[PDB]
């Protein structure tokens, strides 16, 4: 039976999907947090230094405020996703 | 660099830019490498430690 377990583990990696899915979900979580920086969120440009280099403060405040609002809301979304997945992994740790 | 402002470490890179390519872009829509506007040379932008 030990030899059969070794043979199965050497043959297929699909058994470890219960860890692969968690690792992958963390991967798309950080990838989402990365790619949400590229969004304008109603601003004229998504690059903060580009906004700073173009505009005077009386409109730069509004444009940067829009960018901050979009980025923070996307981050809060990531925070709640991480918290609920932490609750899942907590229950999993309790069971283990 | 041609109006593109930022803070980082300018190092010599080994990236193979095509002759019509003037800068490189990372995944997060941030500048990764640039071509010098005065010298036909390739430099990578690494953020400071």
């Amino acid at each position: 039976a030990i030899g059969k377990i070794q043979d199965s583990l050497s043959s297929t990696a699909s058994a470890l999907g219960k860890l692969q899915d968690v690792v992958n979900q963390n991967a798309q979580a950080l990838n989402t947090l990365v790619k949400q920086l590229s969004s304008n969120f109603g601003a004229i440009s998504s690059v903060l230094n580009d906004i700073l280099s173009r505009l005077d403060p009386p409109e730069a405040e509004v444009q940067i405020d829009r960018l901050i609002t979009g980025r923070l809301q996307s981050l809060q979304t990531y925070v709640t996703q991480q918290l609920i997945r932490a609750a899942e992994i907590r229950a999993s740790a309790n069971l283990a | 660099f041609n109006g593109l402002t930022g803070t980082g470490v300018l190092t010599e890179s080994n990236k193979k830019f095509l002759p019509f390519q003037q800068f490189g872009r990372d995944i997060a829509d941030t500048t990764d490498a640039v071509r010098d506007p005065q010298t036909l040379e390739i430099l990578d932008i690494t953020p400071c430690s």
């Binding site: 950080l30 947090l33 990365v34 920086l37 | 997060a28 941030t30 690494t46 953020p47």
Partner: peptide, 27 residues
């Protein structure tokens, strides 16, 4: 990567995890 996101290392790495499992198996 360079956008302020970091990965903190775990307190117990793989070596002491393996030592804990070895102690449990031996016991």
């Amino acid at each position: 990567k360079f956008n302020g996101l970091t990965v903190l290392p775990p307190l117990l790495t793989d070596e002491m995890i393996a030592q804990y499992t070895s102690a449990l198996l031996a016991g």
